[model samples]
Target chain A: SSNMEVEHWMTSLKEVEKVLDSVEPKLTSSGTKWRVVAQHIKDICSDLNQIFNKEDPRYEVVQAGASAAHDFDVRYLDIHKHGREIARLLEKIQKYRQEIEEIKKEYKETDKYRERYDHYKVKLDNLEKKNKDQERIERNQQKFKDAEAAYSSVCADLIQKMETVWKKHVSIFAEAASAVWSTQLQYAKALEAAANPIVPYLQQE
Target chain B: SSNMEVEHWMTSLKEVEKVLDSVEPKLTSSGTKWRVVAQHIKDICSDLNQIFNKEDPRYEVVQAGASAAHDFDVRYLDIHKHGREIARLLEKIQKYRQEIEEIKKEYKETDKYRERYDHYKVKLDNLEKKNKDQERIERNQQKFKDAEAAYSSVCADLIQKMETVWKKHVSIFAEAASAVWSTQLQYAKALEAAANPIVPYLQQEEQEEE
Candidate 1:
């Protein structure tokens, strides 16, 4: 009855929770802006019109300029949305942390179920006169197994939570960074791709 | 006086004027903008800060994002200025078309100086043998040469105007497109260059921790 493994898990559980909370707000609120490019492109287009008439003689160059900033707002809008979603899922994971309170009630730094198991073990030990009390003796032995089983389940519950939250903690960050950088690469790849042909179009005779 | 060469030069002058005026406004107001890029980069920086800690682990990536749109307005501000200057020069060239009107008064469909030259030639052709009138004949011959010289200078002015406007017309467009496309190429080159190293930075072993 002098065991304290459950509280040890609670400490680590809080650490995992702390890390998640510390990093959540940043992910959820991470959205950047291009304050000048849209208008910058517009100004370019107007200036092009000023210099060249009806679709500009260097049409592809102008087209490249047009495509350079095209649909920029619509293109990367998903970054913010996905960030918020990642935070929301983290929040959902965090919400389950409150379950520790209910778990604490069942096995809060005490051996209450083990005490019951010990009492039943003693009862079963003395019931050697298998006369008319056979059923009672057998019931007492069953109670001991049930008490032991209950405590085992409680210990499993706390450990499972520890593993679950920590695993998910690592998973959340791994996936967040994986997807964020992947999206970055994808966006730049698209930019370079779109820019590739037009660059040559601007030059060849 | 059946001369038609001056009228021919006038026609080319008009054509030169037409091209200059047509191309003038285009060059004068020619400027380009980056309508969405500034905000797009901003959005990217904010997104980076979201996933990343302060200064963004891939600092150069965010910085390149920053430099991508930096002073986009001011950097290319001179494009429009230079384009306008090109147009202004063209307009100034186009403006001189008015000289043709003043020129028309003297040489419109006729050669008055040639007429004067011919009249003086006739006066000189019948002078008697050098008598008391020798000075009069010599004066008539000198008047003929002066008339011829004046006509020749007038023809030269018209041809020079034609040549001047046409040459300027070619130069304005050549330089305009040259610089405009050069700016475009410069911008893209800068973009690709800034984006170059950071592409690999985002994936290095150091960033794998978070």
Candidate 2:
């Protein structure tokens, strides 16, 4: 009966394991993608840094560049911190499964119970052992739930932070590009106007 | 006097030549940078494209993916078109310089003038030639101005378009990421809840189960 119960518990754990297996890959891939996005953000920050270093004529662009750099650093670190937390949770879950397997194996061995030969005593002891095993499993389940909740919360926070940072960076770049190009257009217009006096000279002949 | 005027005209053309020389390098460098920026934009488009193809479970994510893909294509192409325009302007300006150099050289050679018998006629012809050269130089200057204006206008357009497309792409990605993660969170919550009922069984004594 104990063996049958163990089999049932193992099957249930395996089912949860399968679900975790499916979810783990997605989490890992998403983490990787997030890091890539972070790297892209850094690249943009570098671009802004270079633009700023050039001593851009516009004061607004210089200020925007500095602000973007600071924002990207903060946001990137936040996302990375959350990513590490998720990884830790993933590791903890894996370890939890291993612990459960070891406990299940310890209980499955009949040799540990052979010394208690009084039939009623053996039955009573087995019942106690099963209860203990159940408690351990439940404890592990709670840990799993806690870790999952934390992971979810962090993911949400990271997403929110990323959105804000992305918008700010986009605005910074847009404003800088606009300012630079507008100044160029103004200069070009002035140059064109300066050349206009030559137009009459060309028409004279 | 006409010979001296032709000399003056040559010197003025050389001055313009010097300015073009200075401007050409700046234009080329700027063009190269713009293309690099365009390439970066394309890289972002590919990133979004890959994210969209991931068979996301949420309908909103799928829609966002489609929109991102479409938006990226339009913006990437627009930036690429502007990049090509800059490149063409660079090439045309280089060619214009070469054309100016050829005309300047043709006029510089006085050996051809020595073959004419009448000196006054030669002087008149040289004056007329100098005037024609002056007109040509002015026309080239106008062309240069037009090219600069066109280049500047295209750059402004590209910058405006980039800003819009970038914001759209960021929004799409943000929404899609949120949706995908939110669904994952929901599934995780459900899984946690589903496992809760089994916790009692885990806690119960074996005798209770029997």
Candidate 3:
């Protein structure tokens, strides 16, 4: 369990670093878009460097520097923890966005499932009711010779209902499964948005 | 030494808290600037809180939570040590500044003493030379005694030189004392500034708590 957290944080930081690295080069000498951001990152790096200066044996560098690094080592095992957390959060946001999309798809599938389930259920009920009506009518006719025919007719109707409902049930399961998958996707999208704001940007044009 | 370190850390944390108390209130609620700083302080406080929480075995929280809390205790000890070191550096800088001021004052006084010693030695030397010239003239007059009664005068020029130089020698002690003091002050300042920047506003500021 202890190692689990360590691994989780390690994973998180690595992910954040990947994103950070992407913009790092551009930050050094980039357009106005990344200029300000680059400067802040540079400052953060400088602070971290000083904090980790080898000459000072006592120096304890914060993994992510002040913002993410704050309360960082205290809560997590290593300096990489804060970075890992940021990474995890970003990943969560991405997953959440995907979930949202999946949910929408599921909603559509759920509609189909409901349609199939209802269609089959109604057909089965009609077939069963028709078989009962025929038996009652044949009883009114009061003929032993007609009894076999009525029984056979009822049996045939029963068979048709069983076959039709069974087919419809299969459709229902397929649709329901689709619905579930889509719902999960929608949920993923929502979670992704909550975890990181980057999802919204990605959603943009 | 271990106990001393523990005591030092305890005191240092108190000082750090005091610093936080002072600066936190002055921080404006704008932008990420104050928030970033305030967050770091909060983190330190939280880490300390976790240590206290874990150290208390009677804490009612669950074992799972306790495990997490224990991690914090260990982590906080590290941060606390850092804070203590910073505090020590600040104290050292203050000590150096005080020593420098004191040494500068002492050196000025020593210079005055040395100047007086030199003046007195010059005066004593001139007086002794005059006495010596009188003794020589007396010898000459005694040889021609038929003209006048000649008196031989003894000039204690060696004694005067000793007395004058001896007084100046005492001044040497003062000069040496001041020189040592000044050298010590400079050395302390160098060590303090090198280890920790002694710039104004760079050192931790004290805060008044309500």
Cα lDDT, all candidates: 0.50, 0.39, 0.31
Error of 3 at A99 (Å): 1.3
Candidate 1 — what's its lDDT? 0.50
Q: What is the TM-score of chain B in candidate 1?
A: 0.45
Isolated chain A: TM-score per model?
A: 0.49, 0.37, 0.27
Interface DockQ of candidate 3: 0.01
Q: Which candidate has the top score in lDDT?
A: 1
Which stretches of candidate 1 lie above 4 Å from their native place? Answer: A1-8, A22-56, A71-157, A201-205, B1-210
Which candidate ranks first by DockQ, i.e. highest?
1
Q: In candidate 2 chain B, what residue range of length 10 has the lowest lDDT sum?
A: B172-181
Better of 2 and 3 by lDDT: 2
Candidate 3, A123: how far from true, in Å? 23
lDDT tens digits by residue: candidate 2, B1-210: 224444554565555456446545543443233233333323432332332222433323323433433443454445444434345545655665675666455554442443332343444456566776776556555655554455445445434433332233222222222222222222223223323322232222222212
Tens-place lDDT digits, model 1, residues B130-151: 4568778778778878877777
DockQ agreement of candidate 1 with the native complex: 0.04
Interface root mean square deviation per prediction: 8.1, 22.8, 25.4
lDDT of 1 by residue, A132-173 (tens): 688887787788899888877767776776656445444444
